[PDB]
């Protein structure tokens, strides 16, 4: 399943090429960091919390779920 670089004539492999990603997936990646801050979102402070703590807490406190021991949502 790997993909390597081969000589033309000898058909003898030479290198080992790293990855296999479609170019449209490279356009899916952000590199711009669209700056918005939680004060700009009024009237959703219930939904703001339970969105953040269900996502950010398994990314900065991994042991905190594992201290009790559950799978994160």
């Amino acid at each position: 399943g790997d993909l390597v670089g081969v000589n033309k004539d000898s058909y003898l492999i030479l290198e080992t090429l790293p990855t296999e990603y479609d170019s449209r997936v490279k356009a899916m990646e952000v590199d711009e960091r669209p700056t918005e801050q939680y004060s700009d979102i009024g009237g959703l402070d219930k939904q703001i919390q339970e969105l953040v703590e269900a996502i950010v807490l398994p990314m900065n406190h991994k042991e905190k779920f594992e201290n009790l021991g559950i799978q994160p949502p």
Partner: protein
């Protein structure tokens, strides 16, 4: 003329792609900088 998949670090070593044939590992010429050979861009390529 072809279409480039990606570059890679430390070295030119561009991954190229053509219409129905294979994908190659290529290099530049002297007449162009390595600047405007950004990824996912159509380029013209000699036959040998």
């Amino acid at each position: 003329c072809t279409k480039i998949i990606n570059a890679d670090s430390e070295d030119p070593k561009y991954i190229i792609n053509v219409k129905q044939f294979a994908k190659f590992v290529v290099d530049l010429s002297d007449q162009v900088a390595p600047t405007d050979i950004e990824e996912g861009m159509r380029v013209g390529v000699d036959r040998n």
